[PDB]
Short mmCIF file of C-alpha atoms and ligand atoms in Angstrom, two decimals:
data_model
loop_
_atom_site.label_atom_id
_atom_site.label_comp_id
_atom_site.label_asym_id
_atom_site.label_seq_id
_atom_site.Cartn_x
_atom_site.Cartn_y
_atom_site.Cartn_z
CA UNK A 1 8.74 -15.26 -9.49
CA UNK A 2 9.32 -11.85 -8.33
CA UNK A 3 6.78 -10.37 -10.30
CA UNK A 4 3.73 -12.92 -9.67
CA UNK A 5 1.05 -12.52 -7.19
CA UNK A 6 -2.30 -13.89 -6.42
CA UNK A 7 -5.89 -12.44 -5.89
CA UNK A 8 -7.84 -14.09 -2.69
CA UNK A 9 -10.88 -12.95 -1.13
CA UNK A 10 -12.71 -13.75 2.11
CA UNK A 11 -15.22 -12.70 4.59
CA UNK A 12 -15.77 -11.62 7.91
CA UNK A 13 -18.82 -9.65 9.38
CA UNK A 14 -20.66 -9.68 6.50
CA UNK A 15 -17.75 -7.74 4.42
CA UNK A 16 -15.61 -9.05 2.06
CA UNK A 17 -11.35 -8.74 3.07
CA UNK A 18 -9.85 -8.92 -0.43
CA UNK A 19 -5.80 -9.61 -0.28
CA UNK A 20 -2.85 -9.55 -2.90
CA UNK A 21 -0.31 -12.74 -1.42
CA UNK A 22 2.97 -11.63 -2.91
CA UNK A 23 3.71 -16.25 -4.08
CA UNK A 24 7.58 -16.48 -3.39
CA UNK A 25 7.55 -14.20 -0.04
CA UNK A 26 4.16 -14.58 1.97
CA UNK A 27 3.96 -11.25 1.94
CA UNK A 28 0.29 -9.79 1.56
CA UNK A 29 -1.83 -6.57 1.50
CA UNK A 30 -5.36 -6.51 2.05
CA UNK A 31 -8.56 -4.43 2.22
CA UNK A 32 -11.97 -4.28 3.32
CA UNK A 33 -14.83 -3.78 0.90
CA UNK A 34 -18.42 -3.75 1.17
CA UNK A 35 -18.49 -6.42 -2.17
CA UNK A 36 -16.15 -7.88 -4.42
CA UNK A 37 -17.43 -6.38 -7.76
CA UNK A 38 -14.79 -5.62 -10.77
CA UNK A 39 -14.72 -2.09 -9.83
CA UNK A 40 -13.33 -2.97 -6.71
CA UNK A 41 -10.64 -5.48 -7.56
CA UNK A 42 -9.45 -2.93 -10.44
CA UNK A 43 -9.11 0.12 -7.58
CA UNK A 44 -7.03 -2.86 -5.34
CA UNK A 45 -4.83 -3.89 -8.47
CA UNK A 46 -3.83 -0.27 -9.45
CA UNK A 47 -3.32 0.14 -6.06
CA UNK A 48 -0.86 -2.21 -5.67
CA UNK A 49 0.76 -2.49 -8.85
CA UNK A 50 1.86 1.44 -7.87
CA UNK A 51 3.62 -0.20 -5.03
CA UNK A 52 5.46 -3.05 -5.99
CA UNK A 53 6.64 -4.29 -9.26
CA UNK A 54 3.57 -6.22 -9.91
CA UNK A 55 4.36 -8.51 -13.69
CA UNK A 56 1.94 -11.06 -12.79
CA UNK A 57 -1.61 -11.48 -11.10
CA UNK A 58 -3.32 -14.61 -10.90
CA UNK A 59 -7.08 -13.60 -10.22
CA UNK A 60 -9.14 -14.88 -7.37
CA UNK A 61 -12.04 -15.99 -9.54
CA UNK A 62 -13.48 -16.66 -12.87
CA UNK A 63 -15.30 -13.21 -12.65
CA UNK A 64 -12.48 -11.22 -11.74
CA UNK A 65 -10.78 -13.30 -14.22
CA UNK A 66 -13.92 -12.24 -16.94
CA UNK A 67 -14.20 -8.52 -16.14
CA UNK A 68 -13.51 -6.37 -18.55
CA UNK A 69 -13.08 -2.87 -15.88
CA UNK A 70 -10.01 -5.29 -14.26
CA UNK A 71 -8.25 -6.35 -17.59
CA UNK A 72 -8.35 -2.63 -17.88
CA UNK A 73 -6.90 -2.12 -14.92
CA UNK A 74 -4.18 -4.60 -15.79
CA UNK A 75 -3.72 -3.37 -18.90
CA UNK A 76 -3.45 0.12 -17.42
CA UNK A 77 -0.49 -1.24 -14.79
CA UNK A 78 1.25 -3.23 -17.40
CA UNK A 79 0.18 -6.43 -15.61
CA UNK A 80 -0.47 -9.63 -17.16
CA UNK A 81 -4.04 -11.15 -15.70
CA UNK A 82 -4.03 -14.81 -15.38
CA UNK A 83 -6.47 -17.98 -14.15
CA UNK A 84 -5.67 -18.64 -10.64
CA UNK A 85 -6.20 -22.36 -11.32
CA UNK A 86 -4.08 -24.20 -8.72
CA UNK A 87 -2.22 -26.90 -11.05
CA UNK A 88 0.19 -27.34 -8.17
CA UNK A 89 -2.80 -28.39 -5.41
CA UNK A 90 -0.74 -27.17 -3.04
CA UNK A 91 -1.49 -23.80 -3.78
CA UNK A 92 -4.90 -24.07 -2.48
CA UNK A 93 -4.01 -25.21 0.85
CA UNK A 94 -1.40 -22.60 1.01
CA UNK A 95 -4.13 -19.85 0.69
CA UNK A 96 -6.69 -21.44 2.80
CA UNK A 97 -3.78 -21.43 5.98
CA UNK A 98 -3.27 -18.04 5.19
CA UNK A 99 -6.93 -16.75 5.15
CA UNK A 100 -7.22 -18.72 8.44
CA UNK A 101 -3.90 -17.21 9.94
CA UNK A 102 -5.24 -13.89 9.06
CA UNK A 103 -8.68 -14.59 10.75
CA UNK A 104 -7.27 -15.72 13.65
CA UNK A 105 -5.05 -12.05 13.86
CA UNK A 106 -8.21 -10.06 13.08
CA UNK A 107 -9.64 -12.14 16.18
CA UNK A 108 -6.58 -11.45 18.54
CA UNK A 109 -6.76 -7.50 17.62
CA UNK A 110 -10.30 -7.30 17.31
CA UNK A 111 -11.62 -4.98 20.59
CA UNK A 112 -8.60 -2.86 19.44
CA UNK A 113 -10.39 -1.22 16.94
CA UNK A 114 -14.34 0.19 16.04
CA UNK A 115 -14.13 -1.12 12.37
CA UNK A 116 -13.00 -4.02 10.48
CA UNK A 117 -11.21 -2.24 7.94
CA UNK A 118 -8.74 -1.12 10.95
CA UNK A 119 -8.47 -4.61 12.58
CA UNK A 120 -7.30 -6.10 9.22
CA UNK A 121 -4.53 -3.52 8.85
CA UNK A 122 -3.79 -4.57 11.97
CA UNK A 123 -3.10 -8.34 10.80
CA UNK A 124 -1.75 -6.90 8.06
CA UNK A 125 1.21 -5.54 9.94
CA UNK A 126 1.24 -8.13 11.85
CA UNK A 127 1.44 -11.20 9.20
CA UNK A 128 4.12 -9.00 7.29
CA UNK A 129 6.58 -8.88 10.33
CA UNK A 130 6.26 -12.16 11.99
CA UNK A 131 9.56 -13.79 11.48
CA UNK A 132 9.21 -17.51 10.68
CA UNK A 133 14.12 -16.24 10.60
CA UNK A 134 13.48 -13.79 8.17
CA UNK A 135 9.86 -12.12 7.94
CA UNK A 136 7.52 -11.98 4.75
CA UNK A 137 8.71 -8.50 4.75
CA UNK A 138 11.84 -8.69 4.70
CA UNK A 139 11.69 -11.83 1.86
CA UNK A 140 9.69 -9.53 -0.50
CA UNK A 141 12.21 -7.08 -0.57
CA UNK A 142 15.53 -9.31 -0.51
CA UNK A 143 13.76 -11.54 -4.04
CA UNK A 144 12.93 -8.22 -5.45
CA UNK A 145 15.95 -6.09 -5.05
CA UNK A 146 18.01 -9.48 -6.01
CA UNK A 147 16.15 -9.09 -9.57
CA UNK A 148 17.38 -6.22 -9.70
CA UNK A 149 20.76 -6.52 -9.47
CA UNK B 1 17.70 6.84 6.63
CA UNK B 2 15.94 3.29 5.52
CA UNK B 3 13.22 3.53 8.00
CA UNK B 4 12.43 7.23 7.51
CA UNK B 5 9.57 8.97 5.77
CA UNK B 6 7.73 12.73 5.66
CA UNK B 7 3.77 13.44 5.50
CA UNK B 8 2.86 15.32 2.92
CA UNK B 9 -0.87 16.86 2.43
CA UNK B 10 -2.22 18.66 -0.56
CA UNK B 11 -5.28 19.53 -1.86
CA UNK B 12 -7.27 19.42 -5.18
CA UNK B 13 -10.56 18.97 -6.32
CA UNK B 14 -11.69 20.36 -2.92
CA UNK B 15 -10.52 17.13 -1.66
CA UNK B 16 -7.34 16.01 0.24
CA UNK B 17 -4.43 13.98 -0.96
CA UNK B 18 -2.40 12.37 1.78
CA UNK B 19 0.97 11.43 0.95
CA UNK B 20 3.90 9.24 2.43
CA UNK B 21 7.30 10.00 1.58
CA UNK B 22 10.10 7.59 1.70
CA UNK B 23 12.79 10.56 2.24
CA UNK B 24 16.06 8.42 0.81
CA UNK B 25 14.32 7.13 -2.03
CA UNK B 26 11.39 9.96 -3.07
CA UNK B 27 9.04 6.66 -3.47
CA UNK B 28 5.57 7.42 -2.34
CA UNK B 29 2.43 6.48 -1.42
CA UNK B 30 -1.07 8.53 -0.97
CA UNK B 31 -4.66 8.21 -0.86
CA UNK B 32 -7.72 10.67 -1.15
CA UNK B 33 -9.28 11.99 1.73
CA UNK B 34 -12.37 14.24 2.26
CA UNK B 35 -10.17 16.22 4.94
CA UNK B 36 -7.15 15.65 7.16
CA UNK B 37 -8.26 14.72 10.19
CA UNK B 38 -6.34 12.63 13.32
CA UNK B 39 -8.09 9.21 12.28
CA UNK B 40 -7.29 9.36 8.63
CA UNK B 41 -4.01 10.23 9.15
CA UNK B 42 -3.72 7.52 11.76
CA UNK B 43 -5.16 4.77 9.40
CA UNK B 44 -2.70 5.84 6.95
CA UNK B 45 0.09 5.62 8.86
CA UNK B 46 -1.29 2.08 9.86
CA UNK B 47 -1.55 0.79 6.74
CA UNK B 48 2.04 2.48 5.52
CA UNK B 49 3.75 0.52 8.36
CA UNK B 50 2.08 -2.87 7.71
CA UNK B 51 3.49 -2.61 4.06
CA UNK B 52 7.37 -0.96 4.67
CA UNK B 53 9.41 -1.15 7.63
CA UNK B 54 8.69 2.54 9.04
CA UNK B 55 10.82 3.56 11.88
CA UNK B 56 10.65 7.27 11.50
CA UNK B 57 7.42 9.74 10.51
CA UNK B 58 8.15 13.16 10.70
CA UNK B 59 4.57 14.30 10.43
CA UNK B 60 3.19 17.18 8.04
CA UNK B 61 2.25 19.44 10.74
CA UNK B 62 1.46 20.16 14.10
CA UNK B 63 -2.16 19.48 14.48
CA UNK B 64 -1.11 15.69 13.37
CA UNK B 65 2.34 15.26 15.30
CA UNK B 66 -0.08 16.59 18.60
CA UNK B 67 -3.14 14.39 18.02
CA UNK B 68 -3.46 11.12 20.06
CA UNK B 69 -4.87 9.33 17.93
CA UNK B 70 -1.53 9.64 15.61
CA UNK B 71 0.03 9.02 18.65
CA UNK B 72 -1.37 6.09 19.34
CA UNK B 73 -1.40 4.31 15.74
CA UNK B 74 2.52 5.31 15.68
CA UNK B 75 2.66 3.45 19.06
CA UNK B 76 0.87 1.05 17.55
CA UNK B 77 3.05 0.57 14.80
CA UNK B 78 6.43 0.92 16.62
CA UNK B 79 6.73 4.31 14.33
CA UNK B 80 8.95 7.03 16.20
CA UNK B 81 6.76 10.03 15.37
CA UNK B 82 8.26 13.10 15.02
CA UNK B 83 7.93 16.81 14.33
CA UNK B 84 8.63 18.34 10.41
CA UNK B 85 10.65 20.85 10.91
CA UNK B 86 12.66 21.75 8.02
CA UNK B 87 15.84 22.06 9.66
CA UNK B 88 17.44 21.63 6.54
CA UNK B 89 15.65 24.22 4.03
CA UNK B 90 16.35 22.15 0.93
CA UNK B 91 13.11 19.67 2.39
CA UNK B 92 10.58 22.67 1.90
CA UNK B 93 11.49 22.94 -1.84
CA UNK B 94 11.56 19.13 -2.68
CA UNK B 95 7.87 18.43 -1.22
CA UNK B 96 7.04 21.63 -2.78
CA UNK B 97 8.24 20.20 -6.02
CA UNK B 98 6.75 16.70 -5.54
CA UNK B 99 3.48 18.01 -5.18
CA UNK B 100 3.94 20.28 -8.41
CA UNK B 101 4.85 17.15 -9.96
CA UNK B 102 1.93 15.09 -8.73
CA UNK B 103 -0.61 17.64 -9.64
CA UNK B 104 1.27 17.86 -13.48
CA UNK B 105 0.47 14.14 -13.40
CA UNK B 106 -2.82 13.83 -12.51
CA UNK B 107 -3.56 16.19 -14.57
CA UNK B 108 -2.27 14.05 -17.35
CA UNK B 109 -4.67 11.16 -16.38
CA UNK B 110 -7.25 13.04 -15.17
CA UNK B 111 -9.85 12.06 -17.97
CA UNK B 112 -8.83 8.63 -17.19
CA UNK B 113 -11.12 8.07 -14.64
CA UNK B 114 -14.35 9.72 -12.98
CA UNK B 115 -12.81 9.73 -10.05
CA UNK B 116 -9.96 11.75 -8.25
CA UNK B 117 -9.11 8.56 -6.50
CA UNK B 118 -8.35 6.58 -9.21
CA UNK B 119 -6.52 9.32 -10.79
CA UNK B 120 -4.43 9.68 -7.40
CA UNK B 121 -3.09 5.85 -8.02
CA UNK B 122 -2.31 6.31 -11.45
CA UNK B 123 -0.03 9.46 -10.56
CA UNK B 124 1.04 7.41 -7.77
CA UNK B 125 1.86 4.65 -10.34
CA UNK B 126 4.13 6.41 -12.53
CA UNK B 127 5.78 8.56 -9.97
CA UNK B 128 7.29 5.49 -8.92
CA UNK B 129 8.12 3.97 -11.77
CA UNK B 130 9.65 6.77 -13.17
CA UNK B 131 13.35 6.81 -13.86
CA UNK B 132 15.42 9.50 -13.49
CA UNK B 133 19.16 5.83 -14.42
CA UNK B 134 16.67 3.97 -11.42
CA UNK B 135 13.07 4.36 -10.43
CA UNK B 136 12.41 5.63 -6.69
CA UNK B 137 10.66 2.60 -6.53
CA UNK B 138 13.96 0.51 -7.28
CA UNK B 139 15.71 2.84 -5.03
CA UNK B 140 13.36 1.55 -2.24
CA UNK B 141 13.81 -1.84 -2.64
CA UNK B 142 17.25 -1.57 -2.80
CA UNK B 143 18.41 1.11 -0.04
CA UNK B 144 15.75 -0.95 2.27
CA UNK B 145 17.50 -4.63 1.64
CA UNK B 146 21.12 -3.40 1.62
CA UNK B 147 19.98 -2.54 5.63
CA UNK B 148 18.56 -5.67 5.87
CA UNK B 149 22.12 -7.19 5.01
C1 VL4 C 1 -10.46 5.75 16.75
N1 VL4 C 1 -10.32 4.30 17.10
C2 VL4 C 1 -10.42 4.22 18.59
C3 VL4 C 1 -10.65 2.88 19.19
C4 VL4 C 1 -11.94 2.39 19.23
C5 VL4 C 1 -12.22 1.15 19.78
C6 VL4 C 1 -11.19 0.38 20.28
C7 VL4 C 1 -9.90 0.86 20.25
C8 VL4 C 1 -9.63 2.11 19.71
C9 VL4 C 1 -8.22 2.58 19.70
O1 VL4 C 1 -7.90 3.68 20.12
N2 VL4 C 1 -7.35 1.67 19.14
C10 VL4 C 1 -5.91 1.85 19.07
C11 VL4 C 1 -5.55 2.54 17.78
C12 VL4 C 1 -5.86 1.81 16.47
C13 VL4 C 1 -4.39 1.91 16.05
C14 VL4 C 1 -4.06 2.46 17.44
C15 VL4 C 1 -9.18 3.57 16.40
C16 VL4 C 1 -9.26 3.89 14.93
C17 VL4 C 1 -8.34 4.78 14.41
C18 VL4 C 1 -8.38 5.13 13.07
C19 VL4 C 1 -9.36 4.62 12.27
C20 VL4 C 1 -10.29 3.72 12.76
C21 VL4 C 1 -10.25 3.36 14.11
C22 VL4 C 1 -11.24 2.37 14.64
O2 VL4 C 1 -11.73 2.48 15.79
O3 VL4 C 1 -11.43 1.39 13.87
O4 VL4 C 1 -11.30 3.20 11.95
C23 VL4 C 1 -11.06 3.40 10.56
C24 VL4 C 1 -10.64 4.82 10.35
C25 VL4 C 1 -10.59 5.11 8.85
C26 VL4 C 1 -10.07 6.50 8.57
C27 VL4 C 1 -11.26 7.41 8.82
O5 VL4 C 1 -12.38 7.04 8.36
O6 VL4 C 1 -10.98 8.47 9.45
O7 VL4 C 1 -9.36 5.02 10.95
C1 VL4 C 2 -14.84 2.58 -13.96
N1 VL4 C 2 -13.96 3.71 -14.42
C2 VL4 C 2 -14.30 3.95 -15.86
C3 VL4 C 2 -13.79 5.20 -16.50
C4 VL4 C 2 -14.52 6.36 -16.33
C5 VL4 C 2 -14.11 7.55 -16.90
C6 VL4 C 2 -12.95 7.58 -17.65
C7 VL4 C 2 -12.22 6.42 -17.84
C8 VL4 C 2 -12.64 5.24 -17.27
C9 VL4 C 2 -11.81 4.03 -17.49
O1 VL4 C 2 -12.31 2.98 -17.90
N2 VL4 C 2 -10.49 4.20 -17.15
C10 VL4 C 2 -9.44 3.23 -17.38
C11 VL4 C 2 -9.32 2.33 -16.17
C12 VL4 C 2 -8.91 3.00 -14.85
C13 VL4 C 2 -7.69 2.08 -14.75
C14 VL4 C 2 -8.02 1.51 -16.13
C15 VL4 C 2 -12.49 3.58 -14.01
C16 VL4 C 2 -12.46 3.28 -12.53
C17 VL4 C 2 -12.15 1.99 -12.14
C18 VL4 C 2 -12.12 1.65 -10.81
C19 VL4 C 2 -12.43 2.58 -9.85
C20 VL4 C 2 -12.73 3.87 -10.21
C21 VL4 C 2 -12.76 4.23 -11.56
C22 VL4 C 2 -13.06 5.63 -11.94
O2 VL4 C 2 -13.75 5.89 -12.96
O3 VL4 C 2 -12.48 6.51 -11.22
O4 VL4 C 2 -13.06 4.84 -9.25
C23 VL4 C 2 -12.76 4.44 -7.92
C24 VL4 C 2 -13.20 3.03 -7.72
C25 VL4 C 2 -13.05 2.67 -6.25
C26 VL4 C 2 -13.42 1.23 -5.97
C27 VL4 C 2 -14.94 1.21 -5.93
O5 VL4 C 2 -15.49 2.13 -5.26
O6 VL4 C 2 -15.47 0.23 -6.54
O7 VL4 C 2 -12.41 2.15 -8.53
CL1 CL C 3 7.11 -4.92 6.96
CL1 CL C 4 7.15 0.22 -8.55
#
């Protein structure tokens, strides 16, 4: 569980906010693109698999999941590209909460910023510290370093 | 020394590469720019801060530690921003280093992609998972939950 994370894309103002939802911790990271072609989720993936130790990625969609440009990318990062079927249902509920959290964020911060991508960095930061009391933050590195040692 | 990190910028490709230091650990992160201006490096900071607990910037130079708009995303962020002075001389040489290092790298995956971006993660990539024995990207994790506790 350390290792796994899954793809989840949604939209706002006619742009697409793709996000990587660290499973045991909360903890996310997210972007703004104009589409979500391969190309795109591959950049996001490399991204993020330079960041954390990324062993897992269950994608966000059957295309994502087909692409060959991201299974290079997760071949590339030594990460191992799965369905993101939800076999527990509660999965799915999980991520829908969470894209409607972070919508609700972008909505609170909104006038704070020109563009989009800003505002989501915004609720970004914001998701990652609330403490619900440890935060997401603070889970995702307390499960990791555990591994670890 | 958890919560502290450097700005770094270097150039290539007649582009600019931004880069984050954590100063404890040597982890990093970066991103491509087409120049350094206030906004990017405000943006950056934002999203550094949404994804590690930042307390301290000490910024790469003075054109960034006086612009407002850094000012105001470190606000934003709850960052302390402060001047980079290398008070202790052994800093100069180690950023020095890292971007000889960084350069050597990309240079090793440079025909890996089309573009300097994507080459910038992959550097990125195994910078951090490089051990030298732990990776800085283990030392992190670790030096950032042992505060935590
Ligand atoms: C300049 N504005 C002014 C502004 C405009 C409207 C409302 C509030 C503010 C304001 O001052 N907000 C408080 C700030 C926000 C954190 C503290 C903010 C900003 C900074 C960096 C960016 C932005 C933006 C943006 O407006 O979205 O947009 C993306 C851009 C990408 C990098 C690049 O392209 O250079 O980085
Ligand atoms: C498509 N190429 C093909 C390629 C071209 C030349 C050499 C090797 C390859 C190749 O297959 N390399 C191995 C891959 C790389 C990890 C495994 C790679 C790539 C993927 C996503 C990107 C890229 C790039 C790029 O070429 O730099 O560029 C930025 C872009 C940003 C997001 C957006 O704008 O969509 O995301
Ligand atoms: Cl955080
Ligand atoms: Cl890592």
């Amino acid at each position: 569980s350390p290792g796994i994370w899954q793809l989840d894309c949604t939209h706002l103002e006619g742009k697409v906010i793709l996000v990587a939802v660290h499973v045991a911790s909360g903890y996310i990271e997210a972007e703004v693109i104009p589409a979500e072609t391969g190309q795109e989720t591959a950049y996001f993936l490399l991204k993020l698999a330079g960041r954390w130790p990324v062993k897992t990625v269950h994608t966000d969609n059957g295309s994502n999941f087909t692409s060959t440009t991201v299974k290079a990318a997760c071949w590339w990062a030594g990460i191992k590209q799965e369905d993101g079927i939800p076999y527990n249902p509660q999965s799915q509920g999980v991520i829908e909460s969470m894209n409607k959290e972070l919508k609700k964020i972008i909505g609170q911060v909104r006038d704070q910023a020109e563009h989009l991508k800003t505002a989501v960095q915004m609720a970004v930061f914001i998701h990652n510290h609330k403490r619900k009391g440890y935060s997401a933050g603070e889970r995702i590195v307390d499960i990791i370093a555990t591994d670890i040692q």
